[PDB]
Design a protein around this ligand. Structure first.
Ligand SMILES: O=C1CCC(=O)N(O)C/C=C\CCNC(=O)CCC(=O)N(O)CCCCCNC(=O)CCC(=O)N(O)CCCCCN1
Ligand SMILES: [Fe+3]
Length: 677
């Protein structure tokens, strides 16, 4: 029922059957001509992820470690495209609406979600401004039409506090009206010294059934991060090498406790409206408005001091940003048939308007003795202020037809966009003002075999506004992703196991490169990613579940005046592989017990785009044990005990630069308890 803007599959533990992220209507994973991965609530829960970015540790084509063990932002690197990777999250069908050009990027706390879909490659024909990596859609919890009431509390190493509830049920006699109220306060320290994480989040949801054929859902999300944990980055020289014989803490705080602040207040409001006209015509409208306050004040290590032996330079950055943004998507779907062809035709109009105000401050601070340092001097030789107002408008009209004929399943997509990005410098009084029309197209064919085997070709296209200056101080013409993808999807009919293989080849044009001392960017640049993703979910018995993934990424600068042509980028492991298992007990003394575990393997990261040194291929173990002490005879009460990186390793995640390497997260430990009623 409905299926326009709805997934409507069946999840069985770690595997789902349908997804619309590649479709904007429920189409089963096995018939869709794109690379989709679903991360279930159970996957997130069992695997003890604290972050959207953490959830996808076990997913092929995804690099989790762009900024290492810092839970401030969600850096998801899809197929080795890391430039812009914060701008990749879609919430309940609509863009997150952050500013990857300021500090105002959002975090959706997994507790509020129940499902993560992930699409790969150029995904713009339905979504618009997007990356050639792909994108990630968070389907949050919706109202349940019968009482579900649960409370949690997790304690962990690193002084981790979590406590949350999730209440839902019908308010109505006729049960046409249902609600949901999620909420969670959440503390933590981090491995890092003098950093504290906080979050306080609530989420009311009200779902109404007016007719049999019409349903309006009302959405609200308030989230307060009074502290942002850690976000610094320390040099290659004392991490990858020894720096004069010693080489930095796994807890090293490059900042200043005196002057350490991160304050993000996320206030969202929206609705999803669904109306069925005919058994042919259904139309949906999704809207969201966002309002976010970000206050930063960080002092950070930028490379070694010439004049002091074992101390780093420290520079200040400070922000007060208020962002306003609203996005709407209006769709119109005809399910109809014409001779043997089942036409599933969508036309769509989406509009998003964003406006950021930014007050940026910066300067010099004291240097810091990198091994066993002393804190206390916190004056700043400020630089000039830099205050902007950034606007962005985006109007999108798109049209899509899924043709079912015999065993063939065809996807056609066409989209027009009209973008307008503005950057008024309030300090200078100078405003850059650029407008763009670009046209994207997708085309995807797949034969479904009666045995449940399905090859598919697919060609798709991406676009996104450049983040650079036209050596005239103007936004450059936007970057363009093109993809050939070939793949093989398979599921025997009486199995609960699913197999994906993807061959991809993605070129991305007009990416900002220049002559090195010369500092005036030109847009003739090109990046080329190709490879093969292998993803496997398998049931053996009712208690056994498995995940296995393999990823080969050949990413190159096909053009760069940087001097880096033929240079493969940093933060892009050529190979990657992961595995996860979970065993429960049917009957006997161990019934209600679930032991689980797996491992992740990352390949070699380059520290720099000139490719001067690689980063140790690191390889981590995650484990857990859970007793549903409901088998004792306390029904609805259950405990989990999880631990990540069981070998408590001190590795670096990756490096942006040689001056900037990010530490891998240490052994995280959970113990958590749940009652339901
Ligand atoms: O090294 C890192 C990770 C990467 C990083 O923070 N960057 O500077 C930029 C690299 C990644 C781009 C992904 N975008 C974001 O994470 C959005 C927020 C962010 O951290 N940004 O860099 C974007 C802010 C735009 C302003 C440009 N930079 C600054 O004002 C100070 C440096 C700046 O951008 N900072 O946040 C402070 C620099 C301190 C380094 C601590 N963190
Ligand atoms: Fe930054």
């Amino acid at each position: 029922v409905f299926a326009l803007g709805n997934n409507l599959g069946s999840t069985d533990g770690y595997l789902a059957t349908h997804s619309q992220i590649a479709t904007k209507t429920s189409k089963p994973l096995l018939e869709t001509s794109q690379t989709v991965s679903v991360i279930t609530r159970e996957q997130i829960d069992d695997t003890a992820s604290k972050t959207v970015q953490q959830a996808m540790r076990y997913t092929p084509g995804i690099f989790t470690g762009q900024v290492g063990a810092s839970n401030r932002y969600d850096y998801v690197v899809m197929r080795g495209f890391a430039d812009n990777s914060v701008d990749n999250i879609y919430l309940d069908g609509l863009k997150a609406m952050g500013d990857s050009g300021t500090f105002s990027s959002m975090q959706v706390d997994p507790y509020f979600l129940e499902r993560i879909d992930v699409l790969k490659g150029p995904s713009s024909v339905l979504y618009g401004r997007s990356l050639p990596g792909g994108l990630v859609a968070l389907t949050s919890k919706k109202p349940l039409y019968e009482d579900y009431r649960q409370i949690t509390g997790s304690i962990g190493n690193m002084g981790q506090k979590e406590m949350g509830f999730d209440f839902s049920g019908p308010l109505d006699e006729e049960k046409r009206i249902a609600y949901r109220l999620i909420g969670l306060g959440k503390g933590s320290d981090t491995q890092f010294d003098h950093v504290k994480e906080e979050r306080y989040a609530i989420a009311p949801t009200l779902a109404i059934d007016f007719s049999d054929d019409t349903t309006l859902t009302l959405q609200g999300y308030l989230q307060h991060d009074p502290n942002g944990g850690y976000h610094g980055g320390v040099p290659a020289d004392g991490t990858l090498s020894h720096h004069n014989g010693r080489h930095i803490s796994r807890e090293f705080f490059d900042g200043e406790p005196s002057k350490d602040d991160f304050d993000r207040t996320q206030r969202m409001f929206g609705y999803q409206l669904e109306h069925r006209i005919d058994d042919v015509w259904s139309a949906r409208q999704n809207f969201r408005y966002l309002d976010s306050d970000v206050d930063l004040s960080q002092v950070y290590a930028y490379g070694w001091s010439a004049s002091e032996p074992n101390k780093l330079n420290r520079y200040f950055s400070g922000a007060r940003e208020h962002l306003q943004a609203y996005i709407v998507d209006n769709m119109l779907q005809a399910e109809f048939a014409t001779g043997a062809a089942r036409h599933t035709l969508l036309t769509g109009l989406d509009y998003q308007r964003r406006r950021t105000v930014v007050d940026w401050r910066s300067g010099s601070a004291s240097a810091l003795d990198a091994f066993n340092p002393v804190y206390g001097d916190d004056a700043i030789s400020y630089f000039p202020d830099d205050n902007h107002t950034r606007r962005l408008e985006q109007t999108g009209v798109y049209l899509q037809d899924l043709i079912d004929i015999d065993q063939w399943r065809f996807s056609l997509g066409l989209r027009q966009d009209w973008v307008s990005v503005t950057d008024k410098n309030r300090s200078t009084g100078s405003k850059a003002d650029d407008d763009w029309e670009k046209f994207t197209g997708r085309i995807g064919a797949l034969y479904l075999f009666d045995n449940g085997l399905a090859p598919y070709v697919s060609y798709s296209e991406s676009f996104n506004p450049n983040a650079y200056s036209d050596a005239s101080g103007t936004p450059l013409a936007p970057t363009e992703g093109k993809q050939w993808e070939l793949g093989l999807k398979f599921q025997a009919p009486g199995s609960n196991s699913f197999y994906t293989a993807s061959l991809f080849h993605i070129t991305q044009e007009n990416v900002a490169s220049k002559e090195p001392q010369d500092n005036f960017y030109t847009s003739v640049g090109e990046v080329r990613s190709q490879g093969l993703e292998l993803e496997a979910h398998t049931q053996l018995s009712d208690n056994l579940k498995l995940l296995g993934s393999y990823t080969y990424t050949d990413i190159t600068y096909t053009k760069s005046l940087d001097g880096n042509q033929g240079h493969t980028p940093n933060q892009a492991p050529k190979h990657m592989a992961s595995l996860w298992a979970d065993y429960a007990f049917d009957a006997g003394p161990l019934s209600g017990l679930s032991i689980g575990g797996g491992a992740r393997y990352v390949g070699e990261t380059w520290a720099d785009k000139e490719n001067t040194l690689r980063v140790p291929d690191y390889t981590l173990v995650d484990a857990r044990i859970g007793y549903d002490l409901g088998k004792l005879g306390l029904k609805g009460l259950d405990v989990s005990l999880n631990a990540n990186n069981l070998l408590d390793k001190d590795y670096v995640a990756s490096c942006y630069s040689l001056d900037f390497c990010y530490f891998g997260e240490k052994r995280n430990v959970t113990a958590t308890v749940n009652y339901q009623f």
